Amino acid sequence: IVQDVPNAPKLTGITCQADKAEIHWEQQGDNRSPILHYTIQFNTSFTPASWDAAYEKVPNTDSSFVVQMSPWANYTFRVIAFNKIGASPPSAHSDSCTTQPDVPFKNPDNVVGQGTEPNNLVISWTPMPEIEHNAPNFHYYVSWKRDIPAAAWENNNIFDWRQNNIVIADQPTFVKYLIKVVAINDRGESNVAAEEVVGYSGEDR
Ligand SMILES: *[C@@H]1O[C@H](CO)[C@@H](O[C@@H]2O[C@H](CO)[C@@H](O)[C@H](O)[C@H]2NC(C)=O)[C@H](O)[C@H]1NC(C)=O
Ligand SMILES: *[C@@H]1O[C@H](CO)[C@@H](O)[C@H](O)[C@H]1NC(C)=O
Ligand code: NA
């Protein structure tokens, strides 16, 4: 038998719920090599040119699948069929689903407090991409204080979601600080308590 990758599946419909979508499709021929699994890909209005995997290796017996959707986003999906020869061209993309705003569901990862020079303290974190913003006017709220009884938190709003640090200067060398980096948007601060990270001014811990 002469084999080839499968034909593009036909996306037949979609159901858009508040926090999930059910995508439906019909395979269109396996060109003589049984379909092994499907991949459901998705793109958003934030990064429309990027197609990322919503789910890989979806069973060959499924003709529909439920995928989770994050708050404040528009999503369109497409399906690719795979057989031993390889991947089929993608199906046409689905109609879009729009999700409503909510508070952020996480705070930034990799929070570090460390000086780069003797008398400063640099607080850094990994920026959260737009799909994690969850509502308009997303910003980071950075707080810090010396680990001294009665010391008050000093705070700073960072409205640039791509910014990954703040530099605090005129600090004593090698002293301890308690630090927090919280995600906040129009709906409120995130629903997960941020970890109080221990940091040190100067270059040593
Ligand atoms: C996901 O990517 C597709 C393109 O691969 C987007 O579809 C294009 O959208 C523009 C309008 O923004 C149309 O003018 C083009 O004709 C589109 N056509 C398709 C046929 O490719 C789609 O809008 C993107 N999804 C989201 C949510 O941005
Ligand atoms: C969704 O698409 C509409 C229409 O293009 C746009 O006005 C809106 O900004 C988009 N929303 C998000 C969260 O990307
Ligand atoms: Na989101």
From 134, 114, 95, select the one nearest 204 (Cα to Cα). Answer: 114
Distance CA 151, CA 155 (A): 13
Distance 74 CA to ligand 2 centre (A): 6
| Ligand closest to the CA atom of residue 75 | 1
Domain ranges of the chain: 1-99, 100-205
Which 8-state DSSP code applies to residue 132? G
For the record, the structure tokens of 43 come out as: 């793109």
Q: What is the resolution of this structure in A?
A: 2.0
3-state secondary structure of 145: strand
Closest alpha carbon to 120 in 74, 50, 76, 169: 169
Going from the Cα of 69 to the center of ligand 3, the distance in angstroms, rounded, reads 8
The verdict on the CB of residue 76 being under 6 Å from ligand 1 is: yes
Nearest to 62 by CA among 35, 32, 43: 35
6 burial type by CB count under 10 A (0-12 exposed, 13-18 middle, 19+ buried): buried
Q: Which CATH superfamily is domain 1-99 in?
A: Immunoglobulins (2.60.40.10)
Testing ligand 1's pocket by substitution, the residue of 52, 76, 97 carrying the most ligand atoms inside 8 A of its CB is 76
Is any atom of ligand 1 closer than 6 Å to the C-beta of 91? no
1-99 shares its CATH topology with 100-205 = yes
Elucidated via? X-ray
Give the DSSP per-residue string, 78-134: EEEEEETTEEPPPPPP---EEE-----S---S--EEE-SSTT-EEEE-PPPPGGGT-
Q: Tokens standing for 122?
A: 């640099």
> Is 41's C-beta closer than 6 angstroms to any atom of ligand 1?
no
Q: Which residues, listed in sequence order, are joined to residue 74 by a DSSP beta bridge?
A: 98
* Ligand positioned closest to the Cα atom of 50: 1
* Nearest-ligand number for the alpha carbon of 44: 1
Please name which of 28, 176, 163 lies closest in space to residue 89, comparing C-alpha atoms: 28
Instruction: Tell whether ligand 1 has an atom less than 6 A from the beta carbon of residue 134.
Output: no
Q: Which atom of ligand 1 is nearest to the CA of 44?
A: 27
Torsional sign, CA 182, 166, 156, 151: positive
Decide yes or no: CATH 3.30.70.270 for domain 100-205.
Answer: no
**Which residue's alpha carbon is nearest to atom 28 within ligand 1?**
45
